[PDB]
Amino acid sequence: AIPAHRGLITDRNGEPLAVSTPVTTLWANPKELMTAKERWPQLAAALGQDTKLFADRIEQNAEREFIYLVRGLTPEQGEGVIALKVPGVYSIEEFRRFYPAGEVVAHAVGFTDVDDRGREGIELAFDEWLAGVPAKPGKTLALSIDLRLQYLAHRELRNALLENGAKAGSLVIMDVKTGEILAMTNQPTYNPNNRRNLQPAAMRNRAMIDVFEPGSTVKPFSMSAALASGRWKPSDIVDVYPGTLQIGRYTIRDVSRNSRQLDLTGILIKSSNVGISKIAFDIGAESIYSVMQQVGLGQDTGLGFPGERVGNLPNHRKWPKAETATLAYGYGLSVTAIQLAHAYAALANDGKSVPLSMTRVDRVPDGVQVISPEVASTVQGMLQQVVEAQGGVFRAQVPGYHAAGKSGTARKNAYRSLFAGFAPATDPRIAMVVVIDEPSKAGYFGGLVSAPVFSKVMAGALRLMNVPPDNLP
Ligand SMILES: *[B@@]1([O])O[C]([C]C([O])=O)[C][C][C]1[N]C(=O)[C]C1=[C][C]=[C]S1
């Protein structure tokens, strides 16, 4: 069988991400090798193998009319072995993958196994498109990924992990208009060109497989349900005093407890679990579940990355009050960073969900209106206030632009620090999620740990895409 040329993977602008490299596999007709034993030591040397074990191997398989000697030698090493002119030694031309961006886009692109077959990421997901048929060559695949945004994201997430002594992290950037993933980076990462002795830990595409309680980052969807109910406007007040609320044996507790009356923007700025719980009791869990289901939290992303986790959105016929509250302030559900980014992309795109893509989108599919454009517009303004208002997430602010977003912190006393947002706030182009796992320095809150990463990556990302500054006189 004639091994086919595996199709080129590029970024959205044709930068090479995975290239088929010529290599040499050497096989032997032992029957013919057994006629030239005096050549074996020179041949053993040229293969790196020991003289004795090489000789043991060939003697044992002297019946077989075929065995492999070595796979995936460089052509140069291959020519050296052919230059020995040993009877019973023949060469096949094979293809191994090289990844020029290396660790920068490891998780997204993935890699091939020993047989030039997709084992991780896009290599696995689009294996049939890229492989061709062993012989017709495989087809070029242009990713949605912008290598320029990917490098910035990679660099800033790495610097955030080190500055906070964190064990892991994820950053996803999405085009809100096209459903395209512009960047997807995880720490820790690995060099896919050197897979000799490296942990399955480093190879985990956390953005797509790590499921977590999103906490306060889904309070905006609870608020979308509130504004869509006809019962709530942004200027309405909730009494959250004294920052706790008993629901049978369950006690809802706010992290900050020096508030009485908050307006709905204030509930988001303070991330008040009591405030959102009381709104949830009024509107019913069904309306909150429905919005979260529709923006894709705990739902199949359709990206068909094998080992992709879907997480869980809990459902009930009759919602108990405790489950109603915990859903509303973002516990009792499990999501991935890609789902959260996708949910924020729909909010940012005036309530319209466009299907997620890891490949360059030339013809944008029709979106689903999952939140009414007026509710989406209102929730955008409130999330702009969360970043810009007194006591807000000022570290999320993006010089030259109106940014909008929401911090989160969950307990796993280890913590998960989250920031999800989009910019520019008036004409959203980009949604971003930053997840940092177990920050080990003093500040562990989303607004302290993850928000500065959002600021710098978003600042860079908007400039690389030549988005015009929207904070003018
Ligand atoms: B929410 O996930 O995040 C808020 C903080 C933020 O926005 O970064 C606080 C309320 C929510 N988190 C919790 O109630 C869980 C915590 C327990 C102790 C500290 S965070």
Author numbering: 57 to 190, 213 to 490, 501 to 561
Give the original sentences from the paper that presented this experimental model.
The PBP3 structure contains a non-catalytic N-terminal domain and the C-terminal catalytic domain. Ideas for such different scaffolds often arose from β-lactamase inhibitor development efforts as serine β-lactamases and PBPs are evolutionarily related and share the same catalytic serine, other active site residues, and mechanism. To test whether the β-lactamase inhibitor vaborbactam can extend its inhibition ability to a homologous PBP, we probed the binding of vaborbactam to P. aeruginosa PBP3.
The cyclic boronic acid vaborbactam is bound in the active site in the same location as β-lactams such as ceftazidime and meropenem inhibiting this PBP3. Unbiased active site electron density shows vaborbactam covalently attached to the essential S294 in the catalytic domain; the boron bound to S294 is in sp3 configuration similar as observed when vaborbactam binds to serine β-lactamases. The amide oxygen of vaborbactam forms a hydrogen bond with the side chain nitrogen of N351; the amide nitrogen is hydrogen bonding with the backbone oxygen of T487. The carboxyl group of vaborbactam forms hydrogen bonds with T487, S485, and S349 and with water molecule W#1. The thiophene ring is seen forming hydrophobic interactions (< 4Å) with V333, Y503, and the T487 side chain. Although both the aromatic wall (residues Y503, Y532, and F533) and hydrophobic bridge (V333 and F533) are formed upon vaborbactam binding, the crystallographically refined temperature factors of these residues are considerably higher compared to the core of the catalytic domain. Based upon these observations, we posit that the more mobile aromatic wall and hydrophobic bridge residues in the vaborbactam and zidebactam complexes are due to the presence of fewer hydrophobic moieties in these low affinity PBP3 inhibitors that could drive such stabilizing conformational changes (both inhibitors lack an R2 group).
